[model samples]
Target chain A: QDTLLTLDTPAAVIDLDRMQRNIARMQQRMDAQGVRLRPHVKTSKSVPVAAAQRAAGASGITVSTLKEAEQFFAAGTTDILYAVSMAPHRLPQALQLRRRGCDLKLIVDSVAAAQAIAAFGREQGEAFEVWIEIDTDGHRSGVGADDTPLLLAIGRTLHDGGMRLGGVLTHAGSSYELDTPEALQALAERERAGCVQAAEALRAAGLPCPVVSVGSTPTALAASRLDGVTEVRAGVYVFFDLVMRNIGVCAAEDVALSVLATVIGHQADKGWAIVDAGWMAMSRDRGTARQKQDFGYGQVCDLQGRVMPGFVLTGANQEHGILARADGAAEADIATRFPLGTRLRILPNAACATGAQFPAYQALAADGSVQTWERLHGW
Target chain B: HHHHHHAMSMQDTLLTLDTPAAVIDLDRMQRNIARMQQRMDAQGVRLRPHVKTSKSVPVAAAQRAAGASGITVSTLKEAEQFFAAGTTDILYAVSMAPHRLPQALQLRRRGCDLKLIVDSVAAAQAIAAFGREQGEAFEVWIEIDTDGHRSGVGADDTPLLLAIGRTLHDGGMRLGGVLTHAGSSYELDTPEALQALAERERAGCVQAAEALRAAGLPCPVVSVGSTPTALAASRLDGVTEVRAGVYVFFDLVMRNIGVCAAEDVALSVLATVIGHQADKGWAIVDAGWMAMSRDRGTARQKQDFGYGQVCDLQGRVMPGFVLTGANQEHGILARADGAAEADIATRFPLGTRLRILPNAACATGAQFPAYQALAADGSVQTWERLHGW
Candidate 1:
């Protein structure tokens, strides 16, 4: 193994080789099936990763928040769909950003939202295009596909209110639990069918429904292989995670983004090796909160940035992290040498939370110091 | 609820800000500090604000800027943080072990008016030994426990305090006084309720100081604080100084305990509504526990604020909507009004902002890289976060 470079210990390092493969592999699978892939950048939040997805045959990009859309749009990428709901307070900023010639399409899941945007559009004298969110598997938001009355009524209500209804967007977020490609395929079919049903319901009510959207890191990369998806916006495909691997979304080898932590001190009697990275550096944002599963925030990797077999950040305090053996009471022994100040990488359990911790990413070029990607924060 | 007292309401105004930011309302913080200070001043006690509240140089400077005589912090990191900010007189409030002796010796050598407090005999011996080795004598205080079981020797344990005081004084370290924390006052029902607890804490410190002085120790300071106790103590006849943190931008937890009203809170999270399911009564906002913090102090109380209260553009919280659940980057706002037309996402667009009242201002404020210091007159400026350890 190559010796770790001498830099400030424990920086968030992205493995370029793994990142390239993760992107290319997903793109190859999606493009070969003739399905348009709208990669979700909410997870990666890195402009280079989105640009890479664009280069790798994705049609456009999807975002969870408007800030992400604004960020990507500012980075010169047009055609952005904010995959989350359009809140009323964000109207002014959205309109201001929209008027700046950004193809900023937004998502809406309720009638009050439509009314608010309609009121704002009349006041601003500009039509706001929106994606009518349809919740198929992800029950968190959106008017259900089964609620034809609600969906059709919202479309008509928004159209009459003069807020342009653009398309139908649905996410199979629950499909992220699938442990096999076949199960993922089934989820994709169910999601696509729900989108079609909801889109047809809107069409039947004389509401314009042009685009159909479906996504999830697992479903997008797998289901884009099937049909009916207008675009697959799976963002974490750029930096795969343990959650992905467990759910059969992607393999551990495909992960790219990881935190570099230093083994600062060791309380040998307590069997805890304290690392410099705590909840602040490696944010306390747990990926396991959703599916009742935890891969221990981020996987402790060797100096080479590969997940070490027997290491984990066992417990974390405000500014201190305790590392221990991953499996049992046996003290964590690693082939990787994080000698005192020596730094090792930690692959995030969830790319979205980890990405948010950084104000910007340092996508290094071959020479290492020369950074190519200067990703900015979004709308 | 707290921003009402602030010169500029900590909520609802667009500052041409970028999304997902942290803001500290100076007007509200000043009110909180004023409330605490006024009580201490009326009681003729000194104020020693804790630097852990903002963890920013300017914020700590604001405490001194707001007439704080000295500051208190739990860790050497916090001690180093405020000291570098030019706010000298500090109390390293946490009990130190032998392993951390080097840190104390180094601080003394650096000319810091650092006061070390501990309840352990071993810690005293180690500090005295380290002081001799560094050829620098350090100022020390002994902790006293009245009702709280966290740390500090009991009031009856004055002999131990005196023994530790004598050993340190004999080793050239100056015996400043005794420090007692009324941490339980945080759980009190009212300031009056806190006053009763403050009496015990004050009496404990006073007794310890008296005991130390009788033992040939001239203990000049009798410190007692904890937001409620510091602000509630009717009189500080025996107490000379106060050490209170969390009174700056009083959190919901503080408010829930009647330490301060919700309106007194100065720090807030700016978030946007992302998505929601009306059937499930779930309105997902951009801010999660990460933005709001993992603290659900209000949730444990009678009025359960799941994640946070949903406020409008003008900072008026929606009548029937409260954040019921939160994930990493998502919040679920449950409608108190069942009819469904009240839009959370529409009100706060994809990029719109909402202020999430922090549960613990100290921890929440520490998470951000910088602060958007909202001045009294609605003017906002950038303030950097303080760093030490």
Candidate 2:
């Protein structure tokens, strides 16, 4: 109790027990699917969280930036995949990582990018391993699966140019828009099939296609099978948020990330209790706004981290959050209910987004003690 | 010939910097500063440019050099930063939490003319008691509500207003003045409405000061503003000082509010085209929600520039181009007309650099470690931005 009371306001509180369960749940699912878990580090952006995932059986780490690769690589995790489409200017940074003995892999979705990677690899005299990104659901960044010519062209551009063809990878990012179990499962299957089809086409052209990777947090958790898939990547499953909850993947109780705030003042007539955690602390990510439920900023919780069923932060400035009932009706006794200096916890709409607003996370232990878990910022 | 040479040379030099860089066009910025100060000078009110937008000492110093008398900060950390950099007159604008009393006390004890703002009588009581206990006559401003948009006591609530003023005065704290921010000015686009709201803001805050003074409370200062109202107003009237942020670097929101032109915006995020989905006509840039920020302020404005309006590296707008969508580290750039730029590859080839004007400069600027102040002399200097509370 004292642990929750004495800490500073607007701190990102991570439920360690909940986080470990989330890690194990995904790892177990991946183990059963007979595919490796290359956990996406963009969600947590913490070395400690990455280490936890590694401890829970994640083989390689997937990063959204070269900085994440550099950060995690220095922290003793060598196997890294730069999942974002390869930027030509960043090839030198990638080459330096490879020369430093970091097992780095790059992904490209276009013929131009593929050619650039190969040319940079050849220019550096380093055979860089490259993966082809396929557009399974036409969500973002990829060539269509049936585009045999483009797939083969990208594959051969890397293989014939003395670069290693790592495989084909796809993210069913559109699955984030689905809320039904049937729909999520169907999209997951389609993601797996499309990625496998791309790999088959690449192999038909006599180009090497060693791996078939596919995922997204929703798809990775909903996939019924992964017959041809070699590995899967998913971020945010490590800290399921209100967005995932509305997507029917997890419940509110399952959210591991929450912002600890303090009641600084009140407006009894407006039924508003102003808290210290605003957009700067909670982030401007209204990911839940478009979902089935619109959690204005975040769902407000009590100091003990219990959801105050109908309470939510209706509005926010840079450092002030207006907490009131979700119904929009004023709770006349707001001041009496939440006096000055009262502490509260707020579950974020998207853990990845909210987590970015802080320098570190106050990881709450099962024993009620808390420790700070540092996270990297600014690529 | 000099302008052309400088533009061409600097554009080439800027593309060499890493993608997802926050850049400040120094020339555009200085012009923006001079314009705002000129208006404030005519209004005959002291200008206190809110440093919350820039958070850079150099940026604040530039404003200070251009006739801004003091700095308004949204956080105490900003208070400390500017204070350490030799800026003594600072207003910690946000209503203070009781727990932060010691932090504010520390600033004043160190000989900094730091001012505190509060809204409720509970807060007033705490500040007064703390002032008496610490032996510090902390100057406190009673926040008055002119628009009913956010925090503050009602301007006409004489009983409550005088109560707070008297409580602070009797408890040995200086009832510095009354301040109101009609932040609701952001919602107005018409200059007539903006001017009316500015007048309303000035009248309400001045009335609150009168009420406090009528009750024998020492209320010397009456301050009010917002970027839009400060620019739209023809007169400050009874207002003593005006505070405005985001004018130093106009944004799409400020532009849509009819306060500034597109050419007046100084801040832009330098991004590189990483990849593209030719069929979808999307050129993916390295600046995403992380770099550009998720502040879709323009989405609700008259002209919705999704994410932000896309600009060329030389600071020229590609008419009808915008960031259509964004992920964590990837922004999708395309034509606003929805027609595919067929040769997306040739148009924004891999490694082609672009600049994006943010929806709100303050939010976008917070996403970076530092700002690269681009000079017209074809050089760039790194200006560090302080972050976090």
Candidate 3:
């Protein structure tokens, strides 16, 4: 915290102590559940952070983009999972990764994507490892686990077409919207049951389905058990944010990432303290807008990371953040309270979104020193 | 009409490019540039186009080629990038931070005509002290808060205004001018409201410049703008130059502000339809919040284009279709009016390429590494975008 003062304003700071604790806790939970932990690297995009997770007994890695897969693989982690539905045009790039000795796994939910992957792999004579995505929650892309006809069709499409029918995976992403532990536990079971059901259906059809993967930050943390799941994947648990805080998984104090900002000026009459950390610093992710407790853009905290009760960044432009009371009460003494050049920390609504805005993060150690951790960006 | 067909045919080549790419429609962009430049010319004001909107040197070069006098940048990185690209007349438009003075001084020493802006006495003093220590006259503009949306001092804060002006001029640093940005113009929709706000921006900024000169301060250039106010201002009697960025690539926000139309948007994100949820009438695309940016700027406007208004590969807007929701790498595409287009699965089959008009081009453009500039002649050029301050 002392080193935070001497640093530049609008810097992304990560508390290594809290981050290690987060990694250890998640690993411990997975160990107890009898499943492998494949932590998603999309949250931080920092190789160092992913390395830390791997050091804590995590196996392999999950990525949102080919850029992440390529980056981590170059960093010497060969086992990688490109977890999005494969776009037909990107099949060539995925094959190139495999040719480079990367044990890369690609997921597909649609028959068209599966057929395309199978055809391309056959054309190139590369037995690409492919996973069938199960739509456990009606959230985003993936085939429904109960949709047996399409499930068997896609499985046969890959296996019969000479591609490795690696496994089945599902992300109960809707789990992020839940706050109660009971609701989260239920979703965890549903997610597990859905992926397991999909894998069982694949095996019943006389096709190979060796792995069943499912997880979301909330469900991963709240799961009482991982009965049939072989591996779990969660991203945001590494650096819990305001959204997770509202979801009842982590407390405000457990959040390791924050935007260190300087009070540039103030609109005293409106009770607003303008800070330099705007939408560009804290991303345009108003993720908590529809949450149980809306943290306008983020929760304002003191330099020491204590939440300044009732204070939130109510408005933000590209380079300006408006700090005001959440209740709309005018703190006419706003200028005196937060004088110009005064420094403060703002916990983001989503760590993944906020961390993406920066080129690198300032890792603050418990020994009162700072280390620069670079973040990879763009596809 | 003849050129329209040529432009349409040129789009055929774009289908070969990868999905989730940033595209700039050169014809519409040139039309927007000419429109703004013609307006500024008629209003008798110099156009210093803000390069922050398109962080591309090619885009800024086009703006300058279309009669822009200088370039206005939001960060020092923009200044350095454009300066290396051979443009000299630059204004670092954000309020000068005390810690960044040394970097500012270095830019000046490198023979770049770099102008800084300071809205506080502390910042002004720091610039003055640093200039005196280095014996370099760092020309700076005093930022005047006309509408009070973000940063700047009140036009009527005579004491503070004069203090900032004199601190620079008296301490041997150049007090170049005064500038104001009516960023609140973004919230308005009607022409009357926009014109009224634009007039207020002009009069208030002009008053501050006059006040500084009356106090025996050197205030020569008066800059005032925001895309809305810059386009709506009826006159520029006391203003020397204007600055606006988003007009270069009109977005859904600018369309809602009545400055441009849907057809005038020059920037778009090209994406591929990945899958669909037939029951929910959703066509999930590869472009998500990460590609389109989480700007949602039009959500509170008179018209809500959820994430962005959907368009075909040829860049034709499909009425009532929008990216209603977005995950990290998936955009939920559906009818804006909640009507189920159950044919969405077949309509946007796997690998179907499309484009999404963003709520704000500046924000969306920042998400990509480069822009695929689509010329009317079917030629595509990749213009690299500046990333991270």
Candidate 4:
């Protein structure tokens, strides 16, 4: 047992080299756009990955939970945004930090949320730091643009609570819908315009909204405009997943993250090869379901980590994965497979969900050994 | 008036309607919990049920009511939720992730009655460092792996484990006892098989505890676990506690292993057969891969179970029935009897509440917001789920 085989089958393995390139390229793309690059570290939870984002010149970071914020905070990086719905329970973690003199930021929409933060500030706590959350396109949660009373009340609540209202944080959540890069350019305007409008309202109400944050991986990559935005927080750009490649966020080569797998069984009789990697390894991401080309779970790659011909993970069953032809296939034999214990590599559908599984990431450099340390997944 | 009375009684009967739903038999759960608790109590054992099993506040309360001295949870989030819901004693099982030290220390400073589980000398060293740096006392148990499945130290490795245990004990950390789990015992199929697993488990764990005591460590408890082993271990000599989970609501996989019978599985997914492709020999149900979780059992068996065992409302497991395929919100059922296409529409109609057998009771039960409790007389009630950070 020199190698110390994994106790749990289908463990997710991340390739270190490609991922670094993905992060470096994203930084390059943001530099080209002349917008402050704040890589959303939510996709990769490994400590080393987050440090890489900082090293890559990420001004700040965005997260989905207080649990995640704590991780980044521990890594000695502070300016943060808890991107999910703003609630009282989740609010306390940030409020406690603000009381402790941490440069923490948050996002919210409703008047009740504003009042909640105001109460925390009044109750022996620094009025918690926050950003006004506006809904560009109702994907999951947010306040629509027309709710002036609620928006104004949020500022009033911050004033009452003695809290620092940071800025406006909004995502063009619906920017994933489009064919041409031009449509993405338009979505950028749409998402950025939404942020500009909110910032104007905040300034009109006499509240300081110095930064206007707009994000959505696609919009962040190709919006052809970001001058008005002080900073942008986009995460999946660090690990370009299969979905990003399909959605025109990045080219196929830009996808820097993939999971190394061990093939367990083959079913030539049924024209399917079963691998030990399943949803447990890949994270159940139906990423391409809404798109034209659905990479069933993930793209099957060669031992060298290249997507093989007609080889896609068709389905998953607990610890076993079924690899078959996504398109019509005339042959049954798969020359790409190694053996019962053969190891192959794969790229995920959604980097955000899949990367959340690991505590630390092992970095492999271009020389095939180890590379510079990049950390992710704190809090 | 007689017909009206009959209709009222019928409405009261709890049907296993939602496919991929978790069902708990209160009477059976109580008996199961009571039996293990009594065994521990008679042996002077301090039983602590794992909260991650049910993840329901009401279930933790039930365990406390049934006689558990404390409860075990994997995450600090669960501990906070359970504590707020009135559960005081909590065991944070599993190795503490390094970055989570602050949260763990925060809980300690907040005066939360928490216990951490550790195995390796390295982990013990980390805990000792955190304790020294934070100036806080840590309570922890040394994990001994009776059967190698996941995380734990071997009884043979106890020399180092106890050495670390002593290092911690000398450094303000309390060595509660030696705990081991026969996690692989679930793979057993028969009573005799389970009995063998249970025997090996108890021997390995109890022996580990004995060795810890021999090494100048105060071994207060000997723990053995696994639902199959807990139910089958006819004896608990030298064992102070049994940490069996999944007995509260047995699933189909457990049933196949003789842990519980099909009818005894109180939890199942109530589903509807929405559409069918007769030429392809597939009848789709509303319950998809997400609802059922890609936990396919039959894929490795003699015959693939597709998704789960399709059973009728009468509590009979239909043989030769295969949930041939599954998507996000749809399942395809195939008849072993090779019935006609028309039968698919007739049997699994658009609004049918087909019962789907679960692969693992613990995982499936966690998905629901609440547990639909069925009392002995078949009355349905909802129990609140444990909510935490």
Candidate 1 lDDT by residue in tens digits, A1-379? 1123543333456667678888888787777766677887777677777877788777878766666667778889888877667767678778978898887888787777787888889889988898898888865677778999879777977888887888898877777566777888888888888988888888887889878877777776667445555666677778787778778766676777777666644534335556656555566555554544455656677666556766777666544566766664746433133334456677666676566655555454445452434443333
Please give fnat for model 1: 0.19
Candidate 1 chain B weakest ten by summed lDDT: B7-16
Docking quality level of the chain pair in candidate 4? incorrect
How much is the lDDT of residue A231 in candidate 3? Answer: 99
Please state the CAPRI-style docking class of candidate 1.
incorrect
DockQ of all models, two decimals each: 0.15, 0.67, 0.58, 0.02
The top-ranked prediction according to TM-score is: 2
Give lDDT tens digits, candidate 3, residues A251-278: 9999999999988777777899888888
Weakest lDDT window of 10 consecutive positions for candidate 4 chain A = A1-10
Better of 1 and 3 by lDDT: 3
Arrange candidates by lDDT, descending: 3, 2, 1, 4
Candidate 2, A75-136: lDDT as tens digits: 98899989989988888899999999899999998788888888888888999999999999
Candidate 2 CAPRI grade: medium
Worst 10 residues of 3 chain B by lDDT: B7-16
Per-candidate TM-scores read: 0.70, 0.97, 0.96, 0.54
State the lDDT of candidate 2 residue by residue for B1-389, as single tens digits. 99999876666358678889999999999999999899888888899999989899999999999999989998888999999999999998887888889989999989889999888888888899888888999999999889977888889999999888888888889888889999899888998999999889988999999888888888998989899988987777789999998999999999999998888999999999988888788899999999998899888889999989999889998889899999999999998888998888788888888999999998999888799999887568789998777
TM-score of chain B of 3: 0.96
